[PDB]
Amino acid sequence: MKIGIIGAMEEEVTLLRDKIENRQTISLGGCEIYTGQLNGTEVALLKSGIGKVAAALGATLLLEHCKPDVIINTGSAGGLAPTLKVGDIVVSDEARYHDADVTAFGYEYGQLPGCPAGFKADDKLIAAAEACIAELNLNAVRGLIVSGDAFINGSVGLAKIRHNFPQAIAVEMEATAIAHVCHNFNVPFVVVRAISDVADQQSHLSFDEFLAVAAKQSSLMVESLVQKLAHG
Amino acid sequence: MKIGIIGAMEEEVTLLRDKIENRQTISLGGCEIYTGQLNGTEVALLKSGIGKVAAALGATLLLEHCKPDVIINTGSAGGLAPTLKVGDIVVSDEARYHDADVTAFGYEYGQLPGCPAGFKADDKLIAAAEACIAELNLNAVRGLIVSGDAFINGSVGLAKIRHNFPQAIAVEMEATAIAHVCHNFNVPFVVVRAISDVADQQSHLSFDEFLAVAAKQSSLMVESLVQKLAHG
Ligand SMILES: CCCCSC[C@H]1CN(Cc2c[nH]c3c(N)ncnc23)C[C@@H]1O
Numbered sequence: 001m002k003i004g005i006i007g008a009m010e011e012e013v014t015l016l017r018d019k020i021e022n023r024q025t026i027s028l029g030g031c032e033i034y035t036g037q038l039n040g041t042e043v044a045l046l047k048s049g050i051g052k053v054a055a056a057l058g059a060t061l062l063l064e065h066c067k068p069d070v071i072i073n074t075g076s077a078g079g080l081a082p083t084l085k086v087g088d089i090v091v092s093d094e095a096r097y098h099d100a101d102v103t104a105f106g107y108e109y110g111q112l113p114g115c116p117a118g119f120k121a122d123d124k125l126i127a128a129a130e131a132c133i134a135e136l137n138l139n140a141v142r143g144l145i146v147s148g149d150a151f152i153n154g155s156v157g158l159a160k161i162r163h164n165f166p167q168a169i170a171v172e173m174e175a176t177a178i179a180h181v182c183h184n185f186n187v188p189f190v191v192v193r194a195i196s197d198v199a200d201q202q203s204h205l206s207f208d209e210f211l212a213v214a215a216k217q218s219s220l221m222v223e224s225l226v227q228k229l230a231h232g
Numbered sequence: 233m234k235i236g237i238i239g240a241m242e243e244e245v246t247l248l249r250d251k252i253e254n255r256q257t258i259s260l261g262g263c264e265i266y267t268g269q270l271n272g273t274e275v276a277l278l279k280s281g282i283g284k285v286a287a288a289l290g291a292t293l294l295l296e297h298c299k300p301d302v303i304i305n306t307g308s309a310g311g312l313a314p315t316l317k318v319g320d321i322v323v324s325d326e327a328r329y330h331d332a333d334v335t336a337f338g339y340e341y342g343q344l345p346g347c348p349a350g351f352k353a354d355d356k357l358i359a360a361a362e363a364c365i366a367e368l369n370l371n372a373v374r375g376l377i378v379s380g381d382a383f384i385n386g387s388v389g390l391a392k393i394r395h396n397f398p399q400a401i402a403v404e405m406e407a408t409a410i411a412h413v414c415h416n417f418n419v420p421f422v423v424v425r426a427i428s429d430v431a432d433q434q435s436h437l438s439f440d441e442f443l444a445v446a447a448k449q450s451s452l453m454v455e456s457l458v459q460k461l462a463h464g
């Protein structure tokens with residue numbers, strides 16, 4: 001098994017990258033892919049850069065150049081569900097765009113024509129993630145993650161998301177793009193992120209303070225998940 | 233010279249596709265790329281599907297698999313500039329995301345971190361496009377094109393764009409994604425689209441009525457532009 005891992009920011013990939021043995025770097029299309037072994041398992045770790053198009057470009061290169069068997073999206077997220085605190089884990093069962101709108105032609109809010117309204121994460125990957133959460137005694141919520149190209153910071157931006165996706169557990173800027181690419185290539189995916197902020201008026205301050213905390217929790221989860229998948 | 237051409241919808245690529253001699257089809261990642269000769273010039277024409285991620289995925293495959301020398305983005309657009317009528321041509325000097333917002337961290341509205349605030353189209357390609365416009369006696373405007381994942385249909389969606397980008401001449405859903413991918417691969421690009429609607433409350437009705445008109449005008453421009461570039 002080769003496990004593909006995608007993170008947007010330096011801070012979200014640095015802990016995993018440092019653990020990769022025999023590390024090689026592919027530099028293509030403005031992104032970096034690091035290949036080698038993570039606790040004995042072959043991995044390909046993409047640092048994509050921020051937002052939907054960066055993520056889409058990077059994921060496409062990762063799939064084409066490395067042919068990973070599955071994709072895990074790691075990093076931070078803005079928490080939306082009431083029981084989430086900084087550091088807590090969010091696991092996708094599904095990803096949707098919160099900023100896509102072709103409802104004038106009768107598509108569901110968030111749905112682009114030619115796509116399902118949402119992209120479902122892989123059941124086996126979800127189950128493995130939940131097993132790791134249990135083993136590591138972490139607080140986690142499984143559910144809908146929504147993506148757009150905006151850093152959510154209270155005001156009207158948060159309000160629109162709570163209005164249109166009251167079931168969304170977290171918001172970020174890459175997951176659904178990754179999900180979409182994986183859908184089109186028929187590659188299983190899961191998102192395993194951790195909370196850096198609660199997407200309110202203070203979220204920029206919380207993000208600066210707690211990105212590192214969130215990166216560490218997600219990275220430790222991903223390390224555990226890689227091991228669990230490779231062993232099983 | 234090999235010219236890369238990208239269109240999102242069937243209607244936007246069908247006229248060019250039908251003119252391709254010795255046509256072959258590559259089907260990968262949910263998109264189609266058609267290769268062959270257009271009036272003697274080698275071309276690779278991508279049908280990407282709609283929106284930013286579809287466009288990004290498709291453009292990445294096009295660049296990787298076909299290595300075109302330049303990229304031309306064809307199709308329809310929502311007109312924003314006052315002198316534009318249905319069928320008229322818009323030529324990018326630049327592309328920006330109208331839905332990207334990381335201003336909480338001091339980036340320019342529409343700018344994603346790690347990107348320029350806008351992506352500049354190639355001066356030589358712009359000049360060739362303007363020469364074709366003159367030769368074909370078309371009404372055109374050159375300027376900023378903005379992209380997002382929403383079909384603009386008056387109300388608050390149009391209002392936000394007029395507020396944040398009063399200089400934008402047109403709006404659509406793929407151009408900036410294509411521009412971003414081309415930027416990251418250092419490939420020159422130009423957008424040459426035609427107006428299907430003016431992005432107001434009636435734009436869905438106008439789009440249904442005039443997509444074919446807009447596709448034809450853009451396609452005829454692109455055919456002329458391919459010839460002009462290959463000859464010069
Ligand atoms: C210049 C500093 C970076 C600003 S953009 C935020 C990063 C972290 N990612 C997740 C993320 C955490 N909190 C969020 C929020 N409140 N809104 C939207 N995304 C998030 C998305 C993107 O890769």
Ligand SMILES: CCCCSC[C@H]1CN(Cc2c[nH]c3c(N)ncnc23)C[C@@H]1O
Pocket residue numbers: 102105113240241281282283307308309310382383384385403404405406428429430431435439
């Ligand atoms: C289900 C029918 C298709 C609906 S989505 C519209 C198509 C046509 N493209 C350009 C386009 C023309 N007018 C526009 C407008 N008012 N807003 C935003 N984009 C546009 C973008 C996208 O590929």
